[PDB]
Design an enzyme around this catalytic site. Sequence first.
Site, mmCIF file in Angstrom:
data_model
loop_
_atom_site.group_PDB
_atom_site.id
_atom_site.type_symbol
_atom_site.label_atom_id
_atom_site.label_comp_id
_atom_site.label_asym_id
_atom_site.label_seq_id
_atom_site.Cartn_x
_atom_site.Cartn_y
_atom_site.Cartn_z
ATOM 1 N N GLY A 24 0.955 -1.288 -0.279
ATOM 2 C CA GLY A 24 0.009 -0.106 -0.191
ATOM 3 C C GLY A 24 0.954 1.300 0.045
ATOM 4 O O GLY A 24 1.888 1.309 0.276
ATOM 5 N N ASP A 142 -12.781 5.981 9.896
ATOM 6 C CA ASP A 142 -12.356 6.090 8.369
ATOM 7 C C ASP A 142 -12.539 4.572 7.784
ATOM 8 O O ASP A 142 -11.687 3.914 7.437
ATOM 9 C CB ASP A 142 -10.665 6.389 8.180
ATOM 10 C CG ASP A 142 -10.235 6.538 6.742
ATOM 11 O OD1 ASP A 142 -11.316 6.854 5.765
ATOM 12 O OD2 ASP A 142 -8.981 6.265 6.571
#
Length: 293
Positions: A24, A142
Site C-alpha cells: 500500500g 475511516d
Amino acid sequence: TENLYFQSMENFNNFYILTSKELGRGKFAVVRQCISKSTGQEYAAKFLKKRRRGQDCRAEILHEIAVLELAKSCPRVINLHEVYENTSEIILILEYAAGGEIFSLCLPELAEMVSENDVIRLIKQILEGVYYLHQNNIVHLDLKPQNILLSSIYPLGDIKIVDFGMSRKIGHACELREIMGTPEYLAPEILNYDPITTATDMWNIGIIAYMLLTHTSPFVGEDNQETYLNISQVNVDYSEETFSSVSQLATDFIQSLLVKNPEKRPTAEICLSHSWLQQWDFENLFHPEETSS
Ligand SMILES: O=C(O)CSc1ncnc2cc(-c3ccc(C4CC4)cc3)sc12
C-alpha cells in the site's frame, strides 16, 4: 535536532528483510511486506512520515500507537508487534493480513466467489471489532472497505480492522482531518460538521454491507458535488434490479444504518442482535425449547 524514541533502524534491518511485495502507498505512509530473519514469519511494515503537510505529526502517531495497543486483546483489530524509528519515519510492524482488502470482495468480478453465509459472518466480525472500539470510547472514522482486511481469501478468513489515522474520542470536533475522508464514505454529520459520534462508524458499516451485497457504491456520483448531494439527501438505490438477489433482512440491516439522523442509527451492540445475523451452524446439534423430560 529531534531524538528518536523507538527501536533503531539498525535493529530493524538486523531483524527483518523487506520483500518485493509493496502492500500500500498513501501520500505520508507506505506499507511493505517483511519477514523476520529469525522465524520466517511475515509481517506488514507501515512507514509513517513524522512530518506531513508542513506539520509535526509524531504526537498523532503516538496517539495512533496508543489506540492499537488498547485493541491488542481484540482479534478483529490488526495486532501491533513492534515499532521502529528513523530520522523521518516511525515504522509499525503489524500482523500481516494475507487476504488483503475486503474491498476486493465488493468488485462485480468476485460476486460469484462470496456467499450470503460469508457476508453475514464478515459483517458480524466487523461489528464485534467496532463494538470493542466503541466500548473503549474509540471512534474509527475511516471505516471504508479498503481499511478492513482479511487473514485469507482462499479460503475466506477473518477480518482485521486497520488504519487508526483518523480515530478520535466521542465528542471531539469535526475539523479539516475529518472532512477529507474519501468523499463517497463520509457520514452526513461530517458534511454538517457535527461533533464526532460512534454513529459515524455505524453509517460506514451500512455502506460495507451494501457494497458486499450489491457490488456497487451506494453514494458515489459523476462528481464530488453529486456524491455530497447523495449523502446529504441519503439518496440510495434500493431498486428491485440492485436488490433482486439480496434478502429482505440484509436490506433491513442496511436501511437501519443509512439514515441521516445519527441518533436514529442502532449501536454496534444492537446490530449484533439483528435477525439478519442470527444463524445456526448446521454441524451443531440445536437444543430446542421443548426438552425431552
Ligand atoms: O494501512 C494500514 O494501516 C495497514 S495495511 C496492512 N496491514 C496489515 N497487513 C496487510 C496486508 C495487506 C495486503 C495488501 C494486498 C495484498 C494483495 C496484493 C493484493 C495482500 C495483503 S495490506 C496490510
